[PDB]
């Protein structure tokens, strides 16, 4: 059966997952929608309390101890494993978060992380009334959390005593708990708080302190711990704890505030945010809350693109994924070691490490954050942690991956944000070091670091360097090496990117040397990995030179990366396999060719993940845009659309848009079904086919939650809106038209020192502006096209070239900004954080 005719998912949950009725802001594509939203939110008292939310907090609101593993599709209820139960704590600072969390205990109970797990609670609160320490039961139906705070209601069994907790971690790692205490009777209530982080201080003091070496002694923190009563008096130290007795009048609440500053010398605002709350102007619970939540939400305005499609279920997953990219990051500014840079992390609630395979994948989205430090820091961190090879090169290496495209992803980031020659040259140099290290890696003593054991211009691996790579399951080939299409595409992509970065820097000699290396790898991929017998790109076994008979989407990375020449009839036929769900299904979105997996009686896992969806989307994108896949009917616009819908659907626990959670992976292994395909047997084909029917389901969600393992928001910016980053001053749009979508917008990209927005509004009726496909640069209309088309705009010349066979009618805006920089004309100044990554100086 064909992919073009598989069913769509059916989203469940809220009617208004983008909370459209909570945001009255009219869209003007010439300005930041999130800025205007924020302005209207503040006018409406956003941040004054937990009943007045900023829009992004409303969207990503999680209420209750929900969900619990009960979902529904169009046919009926299904059980699933791996509900998160709204038990993790979202609120976190740039370095501090809860690795584990006990939501039904006051304070911050669970494994506190400062970069990584400390095995310590942040702080606990004991409530003593009537002479007794009280059990405060959470009413979990009142549990509410957002990216910026957590709140719940705690009550004694007899309901004589209630505490509304509001807790939040500030940007610079102050862990704060507001407790609103109410008694039905006049009472003296003694609160005691204790922190494993800070227990040093004289009885009668108003602060406790400590010093804690973090995991792997990467730094030392100097925690300070204090609290105040509603009248601003401080809690007093007693026995290495803080204590206060409230004189409660019946039915009269009093609000206290506890703060633990996880203070680092290298983060001076950690001290400032703490001191403001200890004795400064943020002592009051309400002011402390409004400052933290406002600051949290300002980051979205400043960093996140705004994406709007006709499918608000996808839009909410896009907001959730900007949050995944922000939440799964470390910005600790640690001196010496690599965490001196803002870096993407592969699952802060999981393995919590920098994995080179996924680092390059994450930067496909983080490059779209408006500030370049949130992508540059990731590739600088890879360059700083690179492993010295026996041959004298430095190659990217996990800082606890069979492969990586960090240099290409870094180059993509530079094509978005730019920078001077020293930035371009640094990326090229770490890139060239890595490519050369891999080419020469036959000299690596660890066999898994040896990626070129026949010493040619192709990457080779054995299955020990790993991924669902069914190619390695070929009978008779256990432990054998093959020259890899994927490894070779990624090394080519790095080499090609390094050549481009050398050129952008002005380093002609190194640009030509890397171009020569790229040209050789490309020639060897097209000559050695092209199976002319069946017009497929295949891995090649080192021992006999035989093509690997079994296939995965990894076979197509030479297309994904643009290694393969275009306009080659034979090369373009390789993508025919994407026609068939039997070969490469849309959902579940597997890496392994499923016909191949079946031919071998199902070796490996039945798992699927965003790590499979991202490269599948990359193949679909390159396939459609460059290798004629939609013209051939191999990968149609409708199929691309269906994959976006399935990818969004997978994010939702039980298909319910209230409960987004990107697990490390999914499967249907526990999907209790019969012979659904009618082949005589109950195997994984049955579980997987059933899961794609009746609106979809995922019966197993893995134990690592709110993680990233690949990422997909780039599809909205680059395929739907069509943005093609370039080194030069020209803006290229190459949209993949989504059938039935009469509007969309990507708002407030930061691209070559310009605000950029893209609008599709078929007849202008949705946004009330120009009809058609419009680009905004610098707050002015650049151009409007009557249709979605492949357009290259030269702002310096005021020309738009129509590159496709559309008869697209384009008009250039009367006030178009002409002076759009090329990437290598962007400079950084002392007021850009990115300057501190490389250096009050400028980077020119
Ligand atoms: Ca929408
Ligand atoms: Ca090789
Ligand atoms: Ca069957």
Author numbering: 38 to 437, 446 to 511, 516 to 888, 892 to 896
Manuscript text:
The GH121 β-L-arabinobiosidase HypBA2 plays a key role in the degradation system by releasing the β-Ara2 that is transferred to the specific sugar importer. HypBA2 is an exo-type glycoside hydrolase that releases a disaccharide (β-Ara2). HypBA2 is a multi-domain protein with 1943 amino acids (aa).
The crystal structure of the native (unlabeled) CΔ1049 protein was determined at 1.85 Å resolution. The overall structure of CΔ1049 consists of a mostly unstructured N-terminal region (residues 38–123, cyan), a N-domain (124–303, marine), a linker region with two α-helices (304–347, orange), a catalytic (α/α)6 barrel domain (348–771, green), a C-domain (772–870, red), and a mostly unstructured C-terminal region with an α-helix (871–894, yellow). Three conserved acidic residues (Glu383, Asp515, and Glu713) of GH121 (discussed below) and two short disordered regions (438–445 and 512–515) are located in the pocket. Because one of the three conserved acidic residues (Asp515) was disordered in the crystal structure, the neighboring residue (Ala516) is shown with a magenta color in the figures. A triethylene glycol (TEG) molecule, which was derived from the crystallization precipitant, was bound in the pocket (a green stick in Fig 2D). The TEG molecule in the pocket appears to indicate the location of subsite –2. Then, we constructed point mutants of CΔ1049 by site-directed mutagenesis. As shown in Fig 3 (right), mutations of Glu383 and Glu713 (E383A, E383Q, E713A, and E317Q) completely abolished the activity. Based on structural comparisons, we suggest that Glu713 and Asp515 are the likely catalytic nucleophile and acid/base residues of HypBA2, respectively.
